[PDB]
Design a protein around this ligand. Sequence first.
Ligand SMILES: [Cl-]
Ligand SMILES: [Cl-]
Lengths: 115, 115, 115, 115
Amino acid sequence: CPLMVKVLDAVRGSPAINVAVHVFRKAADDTWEPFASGKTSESGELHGLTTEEEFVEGIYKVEIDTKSYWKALGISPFHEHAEVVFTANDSGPRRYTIWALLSPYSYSTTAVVTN
Amino acid sequence: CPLMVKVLDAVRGSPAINVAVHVFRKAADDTWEPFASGKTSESGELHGLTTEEEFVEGIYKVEIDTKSYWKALGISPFHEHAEVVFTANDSGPRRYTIWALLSPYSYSTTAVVTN
Amino acid sequence: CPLMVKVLDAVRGSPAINVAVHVFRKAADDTWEPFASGKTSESGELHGLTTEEEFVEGIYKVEIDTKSYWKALGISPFHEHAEVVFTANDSGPRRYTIWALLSPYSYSTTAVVTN
Amino acid sequence: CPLMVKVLDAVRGSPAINVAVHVFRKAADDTWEPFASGKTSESGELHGLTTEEEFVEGIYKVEIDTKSYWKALGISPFHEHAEVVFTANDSGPRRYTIWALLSPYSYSTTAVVTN
Ligand SMILES: [Cl-]
Ligand SMILES: [Cl-]
C-alpha cells in the first residue's frame, strides 16, 4: 500500500467518514490527469488507491472533498476542499500516508514518508 | 483591505519572509485565471493584493510557494505549495485573512473572516 | 511588548474573543506561580501582559481557557485548556508571540520569536 | 486499549520515535498524581499505558517530552513539552487516541474519542 489517506474531524473528535478523495497526476502537457479516487472508511482511512506498479514518479495532487463532508453535517465551511500537492518517488519508491485534520474554517495536512 | 495573507514558519519560530503567493479566480471555462500575487513582507504578511471593487463573489485559490521557501533555507520539503481554495460570499461587510503555518512535511491553514 | 497572545477560532473563522489567558512562572520550589493574566480582545489579542523589566529568563506557562470559551458557544470541547510551556532565553533582543488555533477536539500552538 | 498516544515529526515526515510520555491524574487535593508513562515505538505509537479497570473518571494530563526529542536531533526547540489536559470517562468509558504533530516552534494535538 504505497499511498494511504487518513482524515480526522476536529469538531466531533472522530474519524471523518465517507469523505470523497480524488488523486491526480501531472501529465507532460502540465495538466492534471485523474489517477485514483475513493471514500474514507468508518475509521476515516482510505486504502487501496493505487499499487507499487502504477504509482510511478510524478507530481501528485490529493483533493479531499471537505465541503461536501461539512455540508452533510449542516455546517457551511470555508474551503472547497483540502489540496495536498507533492512530488512522489523522486529518489525511488516510498510509502506515503497523508493525514488531514478538518475544522469548518481550517485544515492541517501532514505526510508520513517511509522507505 | 479585503484579502490578506499571513505566513508563519514553525521550524524557525518566525514570520515566513519573502514567500511567493499567487491568487487565482475560477473562470467560466473552469480554469484558474491569475488574479493577484506578491511576496510576504518581513512580518510574513502580504497586504494590498486586491480591492473591494475587484474582489467580487467567485471561487478563489491562494497558492503559497512553500517548496521554494524551504529550499532557500536548505530544508527538504514535502509539498510543492500550500493551496487554499474557497468561495467568497457577500453576507454583509467582510475581510478575509488567510493564515498559513508551515513545517517541512506539514501545513495548517485557517481563514479569519471579520465584519 | 515582550509577550503577546493571539487566539483564533477554527469553527467560526474568527478571532477567539474574551478568552481567559493565565501566565505562570516556575518558582524555586518547582511550583507554578501566577505571573500575569487577561482576556483576549475583539481581535483575539492579548497585549500588555508584562514588561521587559519583569519578563526575566525562566520557565513560563501560558494557560488558555479553551473549555470555558467552547462552553460559552454551546460546543462540547475535549481539552480543559491549551497549555504552552517554554523557557524564555536572552539571546539578544526578543519579542514572543504565542499563537493558538482552536477547534473543539484539537488545538495548535506556535511561537513567533522576533528581534 | 482505552488510552493511546501517537506522535509525528513534521520536520522529517516520520513517526516521532522514543518520545517519553507521562500521564497524570488530578487527585482530590487538586495535585497531579503520576498515573502511567512510556516511550513511543518505531511507529510513533504508545500502547498499553493503562487498562479499562484502572482508567476511571477524572481529569488527566498527558505530558509529551518534546524538548528531549528535539535535543536528541540537535535542534533547540521552543516548548518544554506538549501538554494535553482533559476530562476522561465523564459519561461512561471511552477509548481515547491522542495525536501530537511536532515542529521545533509549534505543536498540534487532536483527540479521537470512540465508544
Ligand atoms: Cl449568495
Ligand atoms: Cl542563557
